[PDB]
Amino acid sequence: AKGRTPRSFSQRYGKWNAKFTAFSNPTVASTILTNVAPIAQGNFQTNVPKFTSVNEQVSAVLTQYGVTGPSRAIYQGYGLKVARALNRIGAGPALTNMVAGLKAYYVSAYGANPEILDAVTNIILGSPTGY
Amino acid sequence: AKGRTPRSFSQRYGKWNAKFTAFSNPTVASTILTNVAPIAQGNFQTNVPKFTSVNEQVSAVLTQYGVTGPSRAIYQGYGLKVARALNRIGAGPALTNMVAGLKAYYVSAYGANPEILDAVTNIILGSPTGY
Amino acid sequence: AKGRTPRSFSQRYGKWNAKFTAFSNPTVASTILTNVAPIAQGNFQTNVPKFTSVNEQVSAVLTQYGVTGPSRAIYQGYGLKVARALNRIGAGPALTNMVAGLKAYYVSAYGANPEILDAVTNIILGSPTGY
Amino acid sequence: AKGRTPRSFSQRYGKWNAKFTAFSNPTVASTILTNVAPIAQGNFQTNVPKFTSVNEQVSAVLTQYGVTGPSRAIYQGYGLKVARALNRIGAGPALTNMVAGLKAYYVSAYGANPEILDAVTNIILGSPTGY
Amino acid sequence: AKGRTPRSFSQRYGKWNAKFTAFSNPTVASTILTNVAPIAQGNFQTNVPKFTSVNEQVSAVLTQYGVTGPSRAIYQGYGLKVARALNRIGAGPALTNMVAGLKAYYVSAYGANPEILDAVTNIILGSPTGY
Amino acid sequence: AKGRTPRSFSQRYGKWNAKFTAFSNPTVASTILTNVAPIAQGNFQTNVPKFTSVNEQVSAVLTQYGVTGPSRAIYQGYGLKVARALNRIGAGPALTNMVAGLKAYYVSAYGANPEILDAVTNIILGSPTGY
Amino acid sequence: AKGRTPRSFSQRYGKWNAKFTAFSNPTVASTILTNVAPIAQGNFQTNVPKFTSVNEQVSAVLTQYGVTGPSRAIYQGYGLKVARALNRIGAGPALTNMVAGLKAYYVSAYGANPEILDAVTNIILGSPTGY
Amino acid sequence: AKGRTPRSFSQRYGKWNAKFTAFSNPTVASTILTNVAPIAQGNFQTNVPKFTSVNEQVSAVLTQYGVTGPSRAIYQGYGLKVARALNRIGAGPALTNMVAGLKAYYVSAYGANPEILDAVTNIILGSPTGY
Amino acid sequence: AKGRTPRSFSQRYGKWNAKFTAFSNPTVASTILTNVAPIAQGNFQTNVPKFTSVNEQVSAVLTQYGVTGPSRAIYQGYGLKVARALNRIGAGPALTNMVAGLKAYYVSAYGANPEILDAVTNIILGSPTGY
Amino acid sequence: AKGRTPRSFSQRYGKWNAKFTAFSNPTVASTILTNVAPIAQGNFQTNVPKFTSVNEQVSAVLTQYGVTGPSRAIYQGYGLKVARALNRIGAGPALTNMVAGLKAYYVSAYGANPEILDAVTNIILGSPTGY
């Protein structure tokens, strides 16, 4: 019962502004954040290492291909994207379909190199295709 | 002088946790949010109508094709993605490159229909390719 | 969701000014800095030794070549730049590309001597080219 | 009488730690920042418009050449670098020397396109060489 | 009766440390600085414009000769040195002696260019020799 | 990011005045100075003996040449100058260049005696030229 | 329903005089201007930077070509006109048509130089024709 | 002594804001407007009839050529432009140059018809060229 | 819409008198001036040091040439005029043109000495011609 | 006893700021302006007609030479300049000298036309040379 009726700009803005003005009260924000602190810490500790390690391995791979500067971010980004998929749906044919989709995305929108995308996918999933 | 040295999971977690604990203070959160409220309201008012209108137009287009349920989300998402591109870099060859990249992304990763993607790109940009 | 919409000068100034005013509060600044103090100390302790060593060794090299005064800053700066690259991406073909680019930068913009740049690169990376 | 005797890692660390511990005091930070707020606002207002305008113009130039994603950052960064030089020393032969050095830097280290570098320095300085 | 008897390291250190420990008192420091604030402000206002103007003129001169980076500081420093002399002893034969001595100093110790030193002392004093 | 934009006299005066007014606070000054006290003591103890010994040796040398009164300060100053160089850059060709430059400085600007300058350089470095 | 019936001189004068006499009331003018002050400030802040930047760039271009005095105003005006077009309709074939028409206008009516108009169009739009 | 030193965006905005805030005071606006009312009425009375009559004559001319809707505004605008010129500088060769420039302007930018432009300038000035 | 219609002496005088009478009101003058006070202070602090320094240097140059009395004002005037140009348009060919024009102006109208004009433009701009 | 001692920037600024802060008082400004109103009116009435008539005559001259736009201002200004001389010193050899100096000024610094300057001088003084 959250997205059942259409909400126009006026309604979205009104409700967003009401909730923002409410969260800016000292007691409201303090209470909410102090109560959600341990769960947030647990979620960070559960999820972030899988992505920090991907950062480190993709850095190792990018240094061997001579990629420097902001052009590194491209492949770093792609790697993180793949890791997200592996975290969300697991390994299997769906992950293969998403890896192909992500490679097409990056190659045709951002001019990424298919060879370095294969190298990143190999360091993350074990195979260039990911089977 | 922000992303100059590599940060491991320990350093990221420690700094994120220090900042999250600091922001949970009543005075800190209330002060920051009460100071940034008008700029946030202005940015919302400046940016969201361009996306609410895309929502309504793509809804109208999707009803003409019989798309129902979560399958609508796919195309809605695509539309917003395209709108984001138009908002960020502007109209021109870069926009056509990104539209082609997004079409490849969605068709090959999420099994989207090319005809409905063309119809959505037409209602948003004016032509299926976006020239 | 940080650099997705373009920000004009008035928006940048409004947000920067709101945040500067919020941080000037005694409670906000004291809380944030007292929370991030141990992490800042740890980052300083892990990173700065690598650069104090470079300072010492480039000083030793510059004394043997007769460089005095602000002209030492030139080469000191160059050295630190190279060290930054080594701290960021590691050794390999990428570090080679960046060392060549930095040598071109300094020789063309600041009238540096190629021989002393080779000497600083030799004392830092082990060889003039840096392989 | 600031950089006259050599400082080792332990001396730099001790002094940086002393000053950082002192600034974390509520009264010290509050006083310093509340006193320097108007001058910081004046400096922001004097300087930042020159760079936001460069951002917008280079965005326009980059959309006509088909550059998307983090590849834009490269050229954006280069443009800002050039603007920095024009703000520091002004127009003249020194600016020509630095523009040549910056093009060498970016082309050799980050693999930039010479034509797009020419277009960016043309929208900023008026000429590809910058005379 | 200030520098009449010789002081060894132990005596210099004892007295310097006594005075530094005394000035660290809240009342001592606050009283002394609050009392000397207006006289210090007047001294600053009286003296600094003569050197800000020298900075701007030497910058205009250095851009015409293609000097960039730390190599500018050399000439900038020389300029300020000359301005110091002009402030202290005034124009006349003593100023000529000191200009010759400063040129010898800079050319022999820091590898400065005689032509740019002539241009700098010409923008400051009106003549390359300073007569 | 400290000397990247040009500051005029009004900006320099505004920031200097703000910082001077802030430091005159009892808590600000007392906290900063009490925090930097041990590091300042350590730096004094590390550096000042090398200069008190130079004072003693140059005084011994000057008594053997009949130098009395303010004329002693000249050579004393030169001695300290030379010692500064030795403490900063070390022994080598750069120290030779700086000793030659300082000799030219003193002989041509302050009318010092070349023989006594050679004697002071001998007592400090071990040779008149300093090799 | 504003421009539907023809209005002669006496009707325009009667209505203009009525509205001007009404706005001269203290309460009327005070209320209207106090209510529109924030929106006016916002419109100024969003629009004027784009034109001040044009002023500085065209000033730089005109100094390089030797234009002095009121003859500068000519080209300044032209530049602003071009900028106005880019603000209103955007980049594309319509902006090309408007730029060609504006060049024809100024070269025929005000004796402007075609090559300096090309240089102004180049600093503003990126190209002499502005494609 | 009004346009002698360059004003940046912050200076223009500051002065415009100060003046706009001052004018919204009840007494300031009321006084200024009730003082300038008779002079404004006189200026309106002496100037506007020349343009109302031009509007009527150009309306009559446009109805004879079949121009309807917003396409009328074009020529109406053109006529007023010519009328402004005849009011500012008078009849003569300068008016010939300006009429030629205005025709080139409107024909190249707004796609106006040369025949209807000749008819409008003939009903206004007496001749198609305006001699 | 300020200088579009010609104004005779009666209109200029009537409007000037109305505005002078309005400004003499206590509330009007007080509000306007109190509102524009900080911007005026900032503009004074921004611009006047450049001209105070020029006055001081030109007086220094004039004492060396034996110029006394109101004859000094001539050259001071020239100097200030030159500084004005440098503040307005910048350095470049346009400044060369205006310096030549100012020298011709002063030599032909006021009987100034060409060599002393060379000396003044030398102390201000760097060379007698000003390149 | 007004210009007998040299005044530095801080003295000029302090006195100007004192007088400006004083004049912003309601009573001070009101009293001064209300007292000087009739003298200001008389000075305006005595002087401005001589310059409005010059404006009208020079407009008539410029229209028959084909001068349009901002280029008119040049000659208008020149004319006013000449009229100023005639109002200050009157007719005679000094006026011939100033007319020659003004023609040199305008032709060299602003690229004015000698023939149109002759026509302006002839309509103002009766002869191109002004004898």
Tokens standing for I28? 């009007």
Dihedral, CA of residue J84, residue J85, residue J89 and residue J92, to nearest 10: -140
Resolution of the entry in angstroms: 2.8
Q: Do chains E and H touch (3 or more CB pairs under 8 A)?
A: no
Please, what's the largest Cα pairwise distance for chain J? Answer: 54
Residue of D41, D44, D46 best to disrupt the H interface, most CBs of H under 10 A: D46
Tokens standing for D128? 């590809």
Cβ-Cβ contacts under 8 Å, C87 against chain B: 4-6
CA H14 to CA G128: how far, in whole Å? 34
Cβ-Cβ contacts under 8 Å, H22 against chain I: 31-32, 35-36
Burial bucket for residue I4 (CB in 10 Å: 0-12, 13-18, 19+): exposed
Handedness of CA E21, E26, E31, E32 (dihedral sign): positive
DSSP letters, I111-125, are: ---HHHHHHHHHHHH
| CA–centroid distance for E24 within its chain | 28
- Length of chain I equals 131
CB contact under 8 A, C62 and F89: yes
Tokens standing for J4? 């007998």
Nearest-Cα distance to chain G for C14, in Å, is 11
- Buried residues in G25-54 as b, exposed as e (16+ CB within 10 A): ebebbbeebeeeeeeebeebbeebbbebbb
| Residue F27 touches partner D, C-beta closer than 8 Å | yes
CA F45 to CA D11: how far, in whole Å? 12
CA J13 to CA J28: how far, in whole Å? 20
CA J10 to CA E49: how far, in whole Å? 9
Nearest-Cα distance to chain F for C113, in Å, is 16
CB E116 within 8 A of CB E71: no
Residues 6+ apart with CB under 8 A from I84: H4
CB B61 within 8 A of CB B120: yes
Smallest CA-to-CA distance from C80 within C56, C116, C100 is with C56
As a three-state string, the secondary structure of chain E is CCCCCCCCHHHHHHHHHHHHHHHCCHHHHHHHHHHHHHHHHHHHHHHCHHHHHHHHHHHHHHHHCCCCCHHHHHHHHHHHHHHHHHHHCCCCHHHHHHHHHHHHHHHHHHCCCHHHHHHHHHHHHCCCCCC
CB contact under 8 A, C22 and B36: yes
Helix (H) or strand (E) holding C37: helix C26-47
Residues 6+ apart with CB under 8 A from J76: J55, J58, J59, J62
Partner-chain residue, chosen from C89, C91, C95, that has the shortest CB–CB distance to A59: C89
Tokens standing for C5? 């919409």
Smallest CA-to-CA distance from H4 within B28, I86, F2, D90 is with I86
Cβ-Cβ contacts under 8 Å, C17 against chain D: 41, 44
CB I6 within 8 A of CB H88: yes
CA E104 to CA H65: how far, in whole Å? 86
CB A24 within 8 A of CB B34: yes
CA G92 to CA J76: how far, in whole Å? 40
Cβ-Cβ contacts under 8 Å, E108 against chain F: 97, 100-101, 104-105
At D82, is the secondary structure helix, strand, or coil?
Answer: helix
Size of interface A-D (CB pairs under 8 A): 33
Domain of residue E70, residue span: 48-131
| Residue I126 touches partner D, C-beta closer than 8 Å | no
Tokens standing for I65? 């040439």
Nearest CA in chain D to E63: D94
- Length of chain D equals 131
CA I65 to CA I76: how far, in whole Å? 13
CA H75 to CA C127: how far, in whole Å? 76
CB C42 within 8 A of CB B5: no
Smallest CA-to-CA distance from C120 within C30, C58, C27 is with C58
CA I90 to CA I93: how far, in whole Å? 9
As a three-state string, the secondary structure of chain G is CCCCCCCCHHHHHHHHHHHHHHHCCHHHHHHHHHHHHHHHHHHHHHHCHHHHHHHHHHHHHHHHHCCCCHHHHHHHHHHHHHHHHHHHCCCCHHHHHHHHHHHHHHHHHCCCCHHHHHHHHHHHHCCCCCC
Nearest CA in chain H to J56: H89
Size of interface D-H (CB pairs under 8 A): 8
DSSP letters, C77-126, are: HHHHHHHHHHHHT-SSHHHHHHHHHHHHHHHHHH---HHHHHHHHHHHHS
Smallest CA-to-CA distance from A68 within D73, B9, C54 is with D73
Cβ-Cβ contacts under 8 Å, E49 against chain J: 8-10
CA H3 to CA E20: how far, in whole Å? 54
CA I2 to CA H49: how far, in whole Å? 19
CB contact under 8 A, I93 and G64: yes
Query: Which subunits count as partners of chain J given 3+ CB pairs below 8 Å?
Result: E, G, H, I
Residues 6+ apart with CB under 8 A from J9: E45, E49, F9, I48, I49, I52
Half-sphere CA count of A53, side-chain side, radius 13 A? 9
DSSP letters, I52-109, are: HHHHHHHHHHHHTTT--THHHHHHHHHHHHHHHHHHHT-SSHHHHHHHHHHHHHHHHH
Cβ-Cβ contacts under 8 Å, E21 against chain F: 37
Integer angstrom CA distances of residue B81 from A73, B52, B61, B102, E115: 20, 13, 16, 8, 60
CB contact under 8 A, E111 and C71: yes
CB F101 within 8 A of CB E111: no
Integer angstrom CA distances of residue C113 from B80, F127, H40: 54, 30, 72
At F44, is the secondary structure helix, strand, or coil?
Answer: helix
CA F62 to CA F119: how far, in whole Å? 9
Tokens standing for E107? 């050319």
Residue of B24, B59, B76 best to disrupt the A interface, most CBs of A under 10 A: B24
Instruction: Kindly report the backbone phi and psi dihedral angles of residue F25, in degrees, each rounded to the nearest multiple of 5, phi listed first.
Output: -65, 145
CB contact under 8 A, I46 and F10: yes
CB contact under 8 A, I15 and H47: no
Instruction: Kindly report the backbone phi and psi dihedral angles of residue A99, in degrees, each rounded to the nearest multiple of 5, phi listed first.
Output: -65, -45
CB contact under 8 A, E126 and I122: yes
Nearest CA in chain I to D131: I92
CB D74 within 8 A of CB D128: no
| CA–centroid distance for I123 within its chain | 18
Cβ-Cβ contacts under 8 Å, J61 against chain H: none
CA F121 to CA G4: how far, in whole Å? 99
Neighbouring C-beta atoms of residue I84, cutoff 10 Å: 17
Integer angstrom CA distances of residue I52 from D80, I42, I84, J1: 34, 16, 12, 20
Integer angstrom CA distances of residue H116 from G25, H62, H112: 45, 8, 8
Residue carrying the six token digits 């008779």: H38
Neighbouring C-beta atoms of residue G74, cutoff 10 Å: 22
Rg of chain C over all Cα atoms, to the nearest angstrom: 20
Tokens standing for E6? 């010789």
- What is the rounded end-to-end Cα distance, in angstroms, of chain B? 40
Nearest CA in chain D to E56: D89
CA C57 to CA C76: how far, in whole Å? 10
Q: Do chains H and F touch (3 or more CB pairs under 8 A)?
A: no
Integer angstrom CA distances of residue C96 from C101, D71, F78, I28: 9, 21, 46, 70
Integer angstrom CA distances of residue H29 from G14, G96, H25: 22, 43, 6
Smallest CA-to-CA distance from C66 within A11, G103, F89, D1 is with F89
CB contact under 8 A, C74 and E71: yes
| Residue F49 touches partner C, C-beta closer than 8 Å | no
> What are the percentages of helix, strand and coil residues in chain A, rounded to 5?
75, 0, 25
CA A54 to CA A80: how far, in whole Å? 7
| Residue C73 touches partner B, C-beta closer than 8 Å | no
CB G124 within 8 A of CB G83: yes
Cβ-Cβ contacts under 8 Å, C8 against chain G: 46, 49
CB D116 within 8 A of CB D75: yes
Exp. method: cryo-EM
CA H128 to CA I2: how far, in whole Å? 30
Residue carrying the six token digits 């680019």: C101
CA I81 to CA E74: how far, in whole Å? 32
CA I129 to CA E115: how far, in whole Å? 18
CB C110 within 8 A of CB D101: yes
